[PDB]
Amino acid sequence: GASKLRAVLEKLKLSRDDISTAAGMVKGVVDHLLLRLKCDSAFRGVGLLNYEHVKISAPNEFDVMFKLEVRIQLEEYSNTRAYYFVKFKNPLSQFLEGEILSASKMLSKFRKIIKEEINDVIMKGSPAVTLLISEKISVDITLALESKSSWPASTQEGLRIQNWLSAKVRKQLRLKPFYLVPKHAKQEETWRLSFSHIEKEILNNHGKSKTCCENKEEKCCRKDCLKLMKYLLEQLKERFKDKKHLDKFSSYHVKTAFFHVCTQNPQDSQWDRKDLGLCFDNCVTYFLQCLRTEKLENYFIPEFNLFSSNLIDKRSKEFLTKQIEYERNNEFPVFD
């Protein structure tokens, strides 16, 4: 049924040319918001990270990250390995609550400046604000702190790309800044580590060979497998939207499992385009293994289990398991 997979990839691509117009309508709104946010003292160093599509099957839905550079001191929240309070060694004295930078107050002023500027188009805390341009194009804007200091110790044994993309690349990436998005912690003044910029780099520079996918001899199917993985989750989440079991699952879980599959199979020849069918089947099978065993390490923070009982109930996992297994046993009817 590999030809059906490529039938899916055929349609996912044709909608991209039909939405490159939508990305222009987003760039315009974003540039105006940054102009006025930069006028404010607290957001003077605002800028962009990475348009991107968390939901691939929703081409009119974009995700933008506004970055704000800060020299911080970080305090891990309750050994979460991923959530922190951000103390200091400043334009953000506004948002200090004791010695902690308040996500709530910083998020507040963030929204208000955008809600005021958008009146020139409505607004609806990972996704801080969500805009609706006209009535078809939506964009989720996430605020993020940028720190050009060395990465937190909870990242020391993550990003295991050495045998795939090389230890030299791992040192290169780990010299880049890391990011922090305001995110509730099961607490309201915590920040969660983000590496969306690193995720994009290794997604678009994904082969052991530097010339992977730049010639016919080295066409691999890494990218096609992840898109098919995202598309199947998104389709399953929409067929069962009014049952809510699949609501806690996101494309990030699929993206993480894919990075782990890349680590397990680091050779370009294990991703030959001729083998799209079995490559995707193996990708589904690993995700299923993460569901059954309830283990899905954050690719950058290995002690952070995305699939822990405290985050997703077993009944939700077993439901997605059964649905996916039914799809695989029937040549994925949900793809149409």
Ligand X SMILES: O=c1cc(-c2ccccc2)oc2cc(O)c(O)c(O)c12
Q: Which residues are annotated as a binding site for Zn(2+)?
A: 206, 212-213, 220
Half-sphere exposure of 6 (CA within 13 A, CB side): 10
Compose the 43-82 pattern: x for residues touching ligand X by CB under 6 A, - for all others: -----------x---------------------------x
Does residue 252 belong to the site contacting ligand X (CB under 6 A)?
A: yes
* Residue 328 structure tokens: 């695989």
Does residue 211 belong to the site contacting a second copy (CB under 8 A)?
A: yes
- Which of these segments, 162-170, 232-240, 290-298, 322-330, binds a second copy (CB under 8 A)? 162-170
* Residue 69 structure tokens: 């550079």
Residues constituting the chain: 336
Q: Please, what is the minimum distance in Å from the beta carbon of residue 206 to Zn ion?
A: 6
Secondary structure element (H or E) that encloses residue 216, with its range: none
Cα angle: 130, vertex 134, 136; to 5 degrees: 75
Task: Give the interface size with ligand X as a residue count (CB under 6 A).
Answer: 12
Of the residues 110, 178, 299, 304, which one makes contact with ligand X according to CB under 6 A: 304
Secondary structure element (H or E) that encloses residue 170, with its range: helix 167-174
Q: Please, what is the minimum distance in Å from the beta carbon of residue 210 to ligand X?
A: 24
Instruction: Tell me the β-bridge partners of 68.
Output: 46, 145
Does residue 138 belong to the site contacting ligand X (CB under 6 A)?
A: no
Smallest Cα–Cα separation from 168: which of 217, 205, 115?
205
> Which option in Zn ion, a second copy, ligand X, none does residue 246 bind, with CB closer than 5 to 8 A by kind?
none
Determine contact, residues 37/50, Cβ cutoff 8 Å: no
Largest CA distance in the chain: 60
Q: Please, what is the minimum distance in Å from the beta carbon of residue 217 to a second copy?
A: 11
Q: Which is nearer to ligand X, 88 or 252 (CB)?
A: 252
- Which of these segments, 23-31, 49-57, 199-207, 286-294, binds Zn ion (CB under 5 A)? 199-207
Binding residues for 2',3'-cGAMP: 63, 140, 183, 192
Window 126-145: residues binding Zn ion (CB under 5 A): none
Compose the 219-258 pattern: x for residues touching Zn ion by CB under 5 A, - for all others: -x--------------------------------------
What's the start-to-end Cα distance of the chain, in Å?
A: 14
> Which option in ligand X, a second copy, Zn ion, none does residue 220 bind, with CB closer than 5 to 8 A by kind?
Zn ion
Smallest Cα–Cα separation from 236: which of 325, 296, 139?
325
Does residue 84 belong to the site contacting ligand X (CB under 6 A)?
A: no
Does residue 208 belong to the site contacting a second copy (CB under 8 A)?
A: yes
- Which of these segments, 91-99, 102-110, 207-215, 281-289, binds a second copy (CB under 8 A)? 207-215
Determine contact, residues 151/201, Cβ cutoff 8 Å: no
Of the residues 212, 288, 311, 334, which one makes contact with Zn ion according to CB under 5 A: 212
Q: Which residue is nearest to ligand X (CB)?
A: 252
If DSSP codes are grouped into helix, strand and coil, which group holds residue 225? helix
Smallest Cα–Cα separation from 127: which of 177, 178, 80, 183?
183
Radius of gyration of the chain from its Cα atoms, rounded to whole angstroms = 21
From the centroid of its chain, how far is CA 288? Answer: 20
Binding residues for ATP: 61-63, 196-199, 230, 251-255
If DSSP codes are grouped into helix, strand and coil, which group holds residue 249? coil
Q: Please, what is the minimum distance in Å from the beta carbon of residue 205 to a second copy?
A: 7
Q: Which is nearer to ligand X, 2 or 49 (CB)?
A: 49
Place of tokens 């995707």: 280
If DSSP codes are grouped into helix, strand and coil, which group holds residue 128? coil
Query: Which residues bind to ligand X, rule: CB under 6 A?
Result: 54, 82, 192-194, 196, 250, 252, 298, 301, 304, 306
